[PDB]
Design a protein around this ligand. Structure first.
Ligand SMILES: O=c1nc2n(c3cccc(Cl)c13)-c1ccc(C3CCNCC3)cc1C21CCCCC1
Ligand SMILES: [Zn+2]
Length: 110
């Protein structure tokens, strides 16, 4: 894979595999979007749904032209998670943590 592809894969893998001190993987509920039939209220509130599988697909198929493009989609995922999930809830807070994990990973790798 090209250099930029390896960098994005390492950045997103750091975010995906991030665990809290108890070993809980924060990204697990964000890997795959709920189906429209299982959670229609998700699609009523979220205009541009995205999950970590979609982000990995966009890295794999070279859809991000820069690290900034990758960041925009990770920030969109976190923004969608904060929009849908209750403020103060574990999922809402986990998406704030993952924004910071992404930013530190982007700086560490590139
Ligand atoms: O904002 C999100 N929000 C969550 N999910 C997301 C998936 C991908 C990206 C994002 Cl950013 C989210 C998501 C997915 C599946 C379920 C379930 C998995 C079990 N069977 C039914 C669908 C749930 C969820 C929640 C919403 C409901 C509360 C838990 C987290
Ligand atoms: Zn390729």
């Amino acid at each position: 894979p090209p250099k930029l592809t390896k960098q994005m894969n390492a950045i997103i893998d750091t975010v995906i595999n991030y665990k809290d001190s108890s070993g809980r993987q924060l990204s697990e509920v964000f890997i795959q979007l709920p189906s429209r039939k299982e959670l229609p209220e998700y699609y009523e509130l979220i205009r541009k749904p995205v999950d970590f599988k979609k982000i990995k697909e966009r890295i794999r198929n070279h859809k991000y032209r820069s690290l900034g493009d990758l960041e925009k989609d990770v920030m969109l995922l976190c923004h969608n998670a904060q929009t849908f999930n209750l403020e103060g809830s574990q999922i809402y807070e986990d998406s704030i943590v993952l924004q910071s994990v992404f930013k530190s990973a982007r700086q560490k790798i590139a």
